[PDB]
Amino acid sequence: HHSSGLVPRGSHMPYFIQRLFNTCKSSLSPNGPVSEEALDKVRNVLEKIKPSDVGLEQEAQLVRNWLPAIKYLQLHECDSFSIGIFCMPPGSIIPLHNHPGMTVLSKLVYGSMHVKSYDWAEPDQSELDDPLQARPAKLVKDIDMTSPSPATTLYPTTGGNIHCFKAITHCAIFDILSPPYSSTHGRHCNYFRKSPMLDLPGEIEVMNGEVISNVTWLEEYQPPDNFVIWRVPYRGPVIRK
Template identity: 55%
Template sequence: MPRVKRLYEVCKASFSNSGPISVEALENVRSCLDDIKPSDVGLEKEAQIARGWKGATNSNGRRGHSGSNQCPPPIKYLHVHECESFSNEIGIFCMPPSSVIPLHNHPGMTVLSKLLYGTMLIKSFDWVGTEEPIDPSEGLCHLFSRPAKLVRDNQMTAPCGTTILYPTSGGNIHSFKAITPCALFDILSPPYSSNDGRDCTYFKKSRKSSSGVLPSGIDASEVAWLEECQPPESFVVQRGPYKGQIVKN
């Protein structure tokens, strides 16, 4: 059985409308995703380019392979499968060098991610509680800053294992920056749904100080205060043609 088809069958058996049915089921999906290679999804040519990449990026992340200062091309999203029962969504983000997926969250969702090829920087956070309420002295409620603990801030290069983000742990709030051309295979369960309160929200570090007191045992140096924001205009995701096998119910 082709690996993508096998992955689909395992996802079908492992996810319900509320997410993974068990820890064992989630591990089965992780194991299958670990086996996926660029050639399984029609991206072997792109992976070869990434492996031989010798381009450079400057400090603001806007220098491309040609060396000219330009905004990077848009990120492409290759849609592999979305379950009609809304239990999962499978897709691939193909990111050109210096492109960024801004800091965002996956509320109420479990996300498995496998870097198929390339190198990227990952930064992720999880919310932490405060012992005193944050004083809403300015702005609207959705603009309040909240404390989030740093979970990960490092570089990842393929081949590497699958990572799992849980609804409240594992770095559910995260950002990606492509160092070379790279592709990220994502499985979301359940997928985004505004009707069910699973909207994607973007964040930035707050410039305002907060009156909230962190719980004991939380190191303030590992905490960032985040507030909601609009994604930058330069953040563009376009659907692209998927060259691999389209998985259908």
């Protein structure tokens, strides 16, 4: 029945993070995902993620034993995409920011957090208006998420390109970005605040006649000073690149 070790199987299924990296390399480009089918292929692998796949099995146990500093682990950065993990202790915050021209696939690896996200009410006015003045945005998501929760996707103008996170328990957010942030290519991680201007309307009529209700007015701004985030080495299974 068995060869007693003489004939091992070999060419085994690459372990999770290797499989995931391999698929990103084939599914992603400097222009973003190659296709929705291609992006779905990355999404199908990412959904199965476990804390042990990325060396976070110990931190995941802090969830059961339930501003503060956030740890950021960079697993890969190339012109085509980046992979990173935010390890957030309870009560920490990733302040409101956007992902210009970018698609981001994200997965809560463990724990619970709150996400609030918006999109501009008039995406076509991005290149024609001053980002330092108040601009109308529509609410997309405003909800707690608790692992296991399906992977989420934001696009350059839909799915909540402007978002913020607040950790409820210890949690880790696994992010795949294509294209990656690049201050050189005009793709900066810009932060935003609610406009303190008084007389801004709650609803508007935009191009077509569509009435956008519950508008939120956002000003570009420097990130808050209590946002402490430290770069930390990835200590999980190695990626063969």
